[PDB]
Amino acid sequence: SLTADQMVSALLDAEPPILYSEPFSEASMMGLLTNLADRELVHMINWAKRVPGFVDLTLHDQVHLLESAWLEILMIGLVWRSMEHPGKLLFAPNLLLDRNQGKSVEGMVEIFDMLLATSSRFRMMNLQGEEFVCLKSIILLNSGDHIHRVLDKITDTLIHLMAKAGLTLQQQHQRLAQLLLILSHIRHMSNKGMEHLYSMKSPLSDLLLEMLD
Amino acid sequence: ALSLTADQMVSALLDAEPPILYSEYDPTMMGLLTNLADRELVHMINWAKRVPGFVDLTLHDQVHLLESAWLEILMIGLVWRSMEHPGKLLFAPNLLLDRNQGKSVEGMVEIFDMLLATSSRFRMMNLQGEEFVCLKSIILLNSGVYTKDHIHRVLDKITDTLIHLMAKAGLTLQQQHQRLAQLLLILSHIRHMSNKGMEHLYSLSDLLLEMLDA
Ligand SMILES: CC/C(=C(\c1ccc(O)cc1)c1ccc(OCCN(C)C)cc1)c1ccccc1
Ligand SMILES: CC/C(=C(\c1ccc(O)cc1)c1ccc(OCCN(C)C)cc1)c1ccccc1
């Protein structure tokens, strides 16, 4: 219903805050991130409810979308924070880790490097905040009819941002392609992430349902 | 390679297309799929070498891109040929499985329904052959690009090719970048399905370098 520019403003206003973290072992480092993550998830839900077209979906669909996309969203949020910190990841203002410390957790050295590669790619493209919030909304809606019309609106919005940037048509859809292809790499990183979290001993849906309702 | 046109890009990719192989005739499942995939893999190497700008890369990079994308390439091919067979996957012309047949297969418990939905998606989008071969080429160059400027230059060109096909088809410019977005978002799902497959298979850098010595 809305215009390409008020879509930007609405999403920007719905942006979650940057939370603070609470040598490392494997269990203490994953304790830090899990905590930050679970705190971060509360704010993600409130953000999702303010993404245009989300609350119009059934509760069953809202939960399902967040359930499959939550790690993707945390990761692209992490990458966005670490953009101006080459060779490092900004989990929190009080938790900036280089590649060296990432070996505290086994199997995390691979995922770590994939996040750093994404961060450099965003810097190479000089990703804007107006585009970032658009990419993040797409992730929430795509990873899981009405949804596609909303997704089609975000595409127009992204194009609108690139057209106002002074870009000709060729560089516009080229950049659009470049951006969306990164999401495939983000999905990949999430998949490898779920594995590791599954490779651990023992409520998201409970948290999702509790806060969404 | 960077100086081709959209029509020359399409023409090169279409003639680079691998043949649809058959499952081994033996009247008297993962074994059949493994056998089929390994024979398909040999044709994939020949195809990849015909993808514009792929041979401009080093031998090491060619191996890396293929080891990262091979299952995605096989899966999108599976989805493509299963398009006009609703609610059923066409692994081979003589190996056609529907859902209940597929539910009883090793670890295809998750991806079968995903592959069908992807096939449903392409069908209701009316995916053209010219678009398909473009998407498959994109997969080849993009899957391992993060795990280099020439690669992104070829990708941008395949993007230019896709847009041209949509403009010629008679789509408005708004419909053009919308369709392009839809197609590329699907690649995320295909990446997702591949990961699910790789894991199950996990329970190479070698053989590729062997095949590309040709
Ligand atoms: C990439 C860092 C990370 C997590 C993370 C990323 C971004 C962010 O802002 C916060 C954390 C991470 C770690 C643990 C985690 O667990 C939450 C789920 N619990 C309830 C099991 C989630 C994300 C991670 C995820 C999986 C495996 C290893 C590490
Ligand atoms: C989706 C069907 C499939 C295979 C397949 C897909 C498309 C195609 O055209 C042909 C086959 C599949 C099955 C086995 C397989 O193994 C080859 C590698 N071997 C040496 C381990 C590859 C793909 C599969 C992949 C992973 C797990 C379970 C099934």
Residue numbers in the entry:
A (entry chain B): 309 to 330, 336 to 457, 473 to 530, 535 to 545
B (entry chain A): 307 to 334, 342 to 460, 472 to 527, 536 to 546
What did the study's authors say about this model?
We solved x-ray crystal structures of antiestrogens in complex with Y537S and WT ERα ligand binding domain (LBD) to understand the structural basis of differential transcriptional antagonistic efficacies. Tamoxifen and other SERMs also antagonize transcription but induce a stable antagonist conformation that enhances ERα nuclear lifetime. Comparison of Y537S ERα LBD x-ray crystal structures in complex with SERMs and SERDs reveal a ligand-dependent H12 conformational pose that corresponds to increased transcriptional antagonistic efficacies. X-ray crystal structures of WT and Y537S ERα LBD in complex with SERMs, SERM/SERDs, and a SERD showed that the most efficacious molecules enforced H12 burial within the AF-2 cleft. Conversely, molecules with diminished Y537S transcriptional potencies poorly enforced this conformation as H12 showed variable conformations and reduced surface area burial in the AF-2 cleft. Reduced Y537S efficacy correlates with decreased H12 surface area burial in the AF-2 Cleft.
